[model samples]
Target: AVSLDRTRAVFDGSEKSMTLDISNDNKQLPYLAQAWIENENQEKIITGPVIATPPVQRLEPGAKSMVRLSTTPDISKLPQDRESLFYFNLREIPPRSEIALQTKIKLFYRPAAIKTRPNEVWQDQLILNKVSGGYRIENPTPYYVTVIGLGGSEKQAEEGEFETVMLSPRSEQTVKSANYNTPYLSYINDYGGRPVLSFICNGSRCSVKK
Candidate 1:
């Protein structure tokens, strides 16, 4: 069995490389960890913008390894105005024909230009509205915003009012909720920390609390 330390990853254009921690849980035999990158459409590419260094590595039983992910020259051609989405996959193959385990996670490539603004402030740029049967959230920021919790109040959000939602740059999404009167949302920051955003509503229009 193999496991990854993180559920998601982000690669900034200013950084040269990113590393991911993977571990082999089988205590008897050594395993091979194969890493690769896929586009948002789930299509595999050999010479894409992102490539994995040491694509294949051998790990001893119960051993941990780091996989380095770097961008290629193609990265320059990608959009510099907004973040791009990619998928990172790690597969553990046994020595023989044994069934292998594979893990896939969302990876966002952030352009250097977006770094001028702090990621935490992206939530403040959200435009929330009350729609039929639910609430609509619009992300007008340059960075991707992930919603981990939403409820009528902060306490309700902490008590399992959670639904994983990813809002792309300049994208809008409508989410069904029991109560649209209160807009208390918790978002995941760059460091995987959840920070709450409280909104004061004026009928259909809502703005983030100062």
Candidate 2:
């Protein structure tokens, strides 16, 4: 088994910044290093071979080396609140052979609490014109919707005490309401302080419109 000496967890989707310290005490074997990232579910996320000065080189007993790896995940597509794990390994590549003779180190890593901003909200008369897959809110406003908790364990829609519109004398406004169709509302509820609003809206009215 390959043995890793150290590992550090950094936020996902950020600039790649990590270093690996390796040692190969057995000079008779050539050591090859590889690094990869996996999710909490052990799903492989990123993988690559390490670049060393001598490339593939044999290490004398008690000799040490350093390998660096970096990454910048697209946070817009990756899960921001979840933990991402990484692994590194060092193995002996047999002389003139494509087989590993021995394994040295195995290191694991998980990102720390790296906060991300919530999805944006809309404060205007938004027209969702399509029966679609997903949509994005641009220049979101403070008025929005969110589901409180795991949503209703049942199918029925849950209600909140917040109002969406501020109607006065001659001014009339409409806000999108949160409903079963809005999954981002549920996320906003589960994680508070997300500026995003989760609501269903048409050309006029909203349900739990923020």
Candidate 3:
């Protein structure tokens, strides 16, 4: 088996490239580390803005390997105002074994504009509107957010018993599992921190509490 140094990858638009380290955990065996980038739709494209170099690497047991991801001029074709998502796949190929052990993680392309809104501040910008059976969670910020916990009260939200939902920028999603009248939410930030927020409710409409 192999492991990535980071659970998730972030690529700022201001930077030309980003790199991630891969390590082989099995000390008794050597493995080939294959890395690639895929779109959100899981399509493998050759001419995307982001490219991974040294597609294959021979990683000795307990050795650490690094892979570089660079962006091309075509990056301008993507949106500059919001965060875009891609997947980074790392496959561990054991010597003589025909099995493909692969791992995928989220790679977020954050635009420079996102810096205008502090990471800690944007999550509270999420809006919740009461729907028929559940509520509609709306994201107006230019960043992507992962809502880990949601409930009607602080304690309930802290329980984090609901399904984890990822909210895209300028997008809205509905969840029927939460039948709460008022919603409190906890979201995962860039640094893998969880920040919780309570909403100020006025009937069916609710806004996040700072």
The lDDT per prediction is 0.84, 0.37, 0.83
Model 3 spans with C-alpha error above 4 angstroms: 97-99, 116-119, 158-160
* Model 2 ranges with Cα > 4 A deviation: 7-15, 27-30, 34-61, 73-76, 97-210
TM-score versus the correct structure, for each prediction: 0.88, 0.35, 0.89
- Positional deviation of 21 in candidate 3, in angstroms? 1.6
Looking at model 2, residue 121 earns an lDDT score of 34
Q: What are the per-residue Cα lDDT tens digits for candidate 3 across 35-61?
A: 899987878755778888888999898
Question: In candidate 2, how many Å is residue 96 off?
Answer: 4.0
State the lDDT at 191 in candidate 3.
68
- Sort the candidates on lDDT, descending order: 1, 3, 2
Task: TM-score winner between 2 and 3, please give it.
Answer: 3
Error at 183, model 1, angstroms? 1.6
Q: Which of candidates 1 and 3 is the stronger one according to lDDT?
A: 1
* Highest lDDT scorer: 1
